[model samples]
Target: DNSRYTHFLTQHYDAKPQGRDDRYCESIMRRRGLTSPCKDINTFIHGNKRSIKAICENKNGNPHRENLRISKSSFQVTTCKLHGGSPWPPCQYRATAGFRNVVVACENGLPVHLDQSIFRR
Candidate 1:
């Protein structure tokens, strides 16, 4: 499934979207040396554990949950115009190291979960 896209990405390098700003997507891509603009969102998320954690924590080594003034259990979810129609509600999501998982739909619009079960299988 992804092999076709990978080939497309390899052939059409420049047409892929280049991320600006310090976006999580961009950070993950850069850190992993991703050449294709066409990203496997789940794959990107899987590789970016450290970067995601740093984004949610404060300098004092506490989760920035309260200081950000978001709702309860909403500290890590970031709003991006890409997900929903508008960015106000933000994406209701988070990245975790265990048990929990973050899933991403591909350009084909299928949610792929980041879970050990998949890796184990």
Candidate 2:
């Protein structure tokens, strides 16, 4: 039902926090005034009915102990959708910040991101 889809977007898009270390998330929050600092990965997954799209992290620590804080970084995004939906026009959502923009696409039953440019394009 259309209401189900609308409710889904409203709940997740509204609850999402605004502004994060991640530029893409910040930009989305800024432009759309959407909340950032989402509750948590689990909350996001549960609310959107989606799963993790991708995750990036640095396992190794920096050489300098003082700079250890910058040693490891982790970022994750999840893709969510409803079932039994027909493929017509592709669904697109973008989160951009700093010099980076990440676009996510959900086609059919899968979520995909482009390898280059950090964008779905």
Candidate 3:
């Protein structure tokens, strides 16, 4: 598994909204190397490696063709929405908090991709 990406997620994508504000995306995305123009949407998962790993091993639902999966009660996620305007320096975002079972693509027991279809609102 690519621990670098996992480390990136653990460092930048952990969904704790402790000191986050409207400028959160602007600062974090850039600091995390997502760069200018920013991203339209981003989802951060809220939990630790153990808990997130458990979701991949869960069998509460049908597994995907890639063999990655998640149950309906494993974790939570927060979505960030970027406001459209100038695609440069001052990127704006609205942080929308949420909770749902996350679906992820797994490799060697670590999550590699977020499956957008299986999220429950």
Q: Best candidate per TM-score, number? A: 3
Encode model 3's per-residue lDDT on 22-110: one tens digit a residue.
67656666676554666666667775656666655654333766656765564556666668766575667776666666766666666
Off by over 4 Å in 2: 10-21, 36-121
Q: Candidate 1, residues 1-121: lDDT per residue as tens digits?
A: 6564453223212222233233554344444444233232223222223332332233212322232211112112211123323333223222222222332222332222222223222
Which lDDT tens digits does candidate 2 get at residues 84-105?
3333322223333222222223
TM-score each candidate: 0.21, 0.21, 0.72
Candidate 2 CA-lDDT value? 0.28
Residue pairs of candidate 2 with colliding backbone atoms: 16-35, 17-35, 17-36, 18-35, 18-36, 23-97, 24-96, 24-97, 50-80
Minimal lDDT window, size 10, model 3: 53-62
Whole-model Cα lDDT of every candidate shown, in order: 0.29, 0.28, 0.61
